[PDB]
Amino acid sequence: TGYVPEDGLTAQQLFASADDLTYNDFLILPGFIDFIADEVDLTSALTRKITLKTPLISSPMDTVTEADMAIAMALMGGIGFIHHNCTPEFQANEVRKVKNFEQGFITDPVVLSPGIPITEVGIVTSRDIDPRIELVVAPAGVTLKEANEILQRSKKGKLPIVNDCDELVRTDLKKNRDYPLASKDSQKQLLCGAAVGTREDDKYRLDLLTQAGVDVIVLDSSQGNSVYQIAMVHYIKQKYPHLQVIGGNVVTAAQAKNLIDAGVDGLRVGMGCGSICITQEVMACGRPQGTAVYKVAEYARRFGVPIIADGGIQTVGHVVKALALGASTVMMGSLLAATTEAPGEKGSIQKFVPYLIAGIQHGCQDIGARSLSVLRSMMYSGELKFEKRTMSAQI
């Protein structure tokens, strides 16, 4: 399957040359195809205990991931991490929105205020204002079929729901979408992630996120191999047994070692690649992303610790290379920054992610792998071949 004469280079040869590699520094050599692209399985491990249908995860940047993005990202098979450039209460509240989502229901109903509902029974509709009104309600439990029917009868849009005197939640929907890849937890709620620092002060924020029901926590740092992060990992692993923890950014196996001994459930890899902020400029330390993912993933798989290729992704090709090199998932920031669901006053994630999924599936087919797992497997075993490009692209 690999070759007859002289093919290209194995990953152990390529990443052993003398130069650190970038995603654009090489190409993967194609193989044998005996299946259709839609047969390729993209199931990926996000952490030791969390598995997703796709390997896509949105970055915890204030220009990328909030409730909007996380929900969309989760419905299409991935997951989003809520940025922490806000107050602990604000961030915790975004998580809450993600965990309470369910199509057909209004995310946040403006209940009373002294159309909106009364009795934090009545309603303050735009007509009785252009003073409350006796509104009609439906019994808790009603389905979207038993609701979008009751609504069509009385010619309405919203359907205030009641059962014990409080307002639990229904809206327009006459061709609802289906989400077969949706990332959900054991209770059928969408999965959500959130970023946090590693200072004592962050312990209060961690507490709110955990009460809000966050599933994964990523310790946001440009250099995660520190006594501070390690102690924070120990703490969480101790006080929140049901919370998965992804460890601060690292780019070498030596850094990975300390965080793994500490008990991280996953590693975020990258430094020097990806977007930049004035509050965090790049200095002398870093590492080409291709090499980083490979060298860290090679050591991490020894302990069953998944790796997230964070930064530098600009195309599907980049994604498939990151995965082929050992990463279990890929984190994207700027490539998603231009979607509808990204915070701020390329279309919707509902069209884009499916586009990336198809692309990755075609990437796998060209190399002859029926899944991303077979892929990493072909590379570790020396079957997968690559080819280095000269520093003057002409492909």
| Residue 360 to residue 307: CA distance in whole angstroms | 18
Q: What is the dihedral of CA 309, 310, 314, 315, to 10 degrees?
A: 30
Determine, following the binding rule CB under 8 A, whether residue 301 of this chain makes contact with a copy of itself: no
Q: Which of 10, 11, 20, 148 binds a copy of itself (CB under 8 A)?
A: 20
Which candidate in 192, 277, 285, 364 is catalytic? 277
Residue of minimal CB distance from ligand CPR?
Answer: 274
> Using CB distances below 5 to 8 A depending on partner kind, what does residue 147 bind out of a copy of itself, ligand CPR, none?
none
| Residue 253 to residue 239: CA distance in whole angstroms | 27
DSSP assignments along 125-161, one per residue: -TTTT---B----EETT--STTTTTHHHHHT-S---E
**CB nearer to ligand CPR: pick between 269 and 367:** 269
Determine, following the binding rule CB under 8 A, whether residue 352 of this chain makes contact with a copy of itself: no
**CB nearer to ligand CPR: pick between 78 and 117:** 78
| Residue 96 to residue 100: CA distance in whole angstroms | 6
Residue bearing tokens 């902020």: 277
Instruction: Determine the straight-line distance between the first and last CA of the chain, rounded to whole angstroms.
Output: 24
Site string for a copy of itself, 139-178 (x = CB under 8 A): ----------------------------------------
Residue 277 known to be catalytic: yes
Q: How many residues bind a copy of itself (CB under 8 A)?
A: 81
Binding region for ligand CPR (CB under 6 A):
59, 61, 222, 270, 274-277, 280, 310-313, 331-335
- Of 336, 360, 388, the closest CA to residue 58 belongs to 336
| Residue 271 to residue 274: CA distance in whole angstroms | 8
> Using CB distances below 5 to 8 A depending on partner kind, what does residue 272 bind out of ligand CPR, a copy of itself, none?
a copy of itself
**CB nearer to ligand CPR: pick between 118 and 325:** 325
77, 52 contact by CB (below 8 A): yes
- What's the DSSP call for residue 301? G
**CB nearer to a copy of itself: pick between 48 and 257:** 257
> Using CB distances below 5 to 8 A depending on partner kind, what does residue 357 bind out of ligand CPR, a copy of itself, none?
none
- Active-site residue set: 277
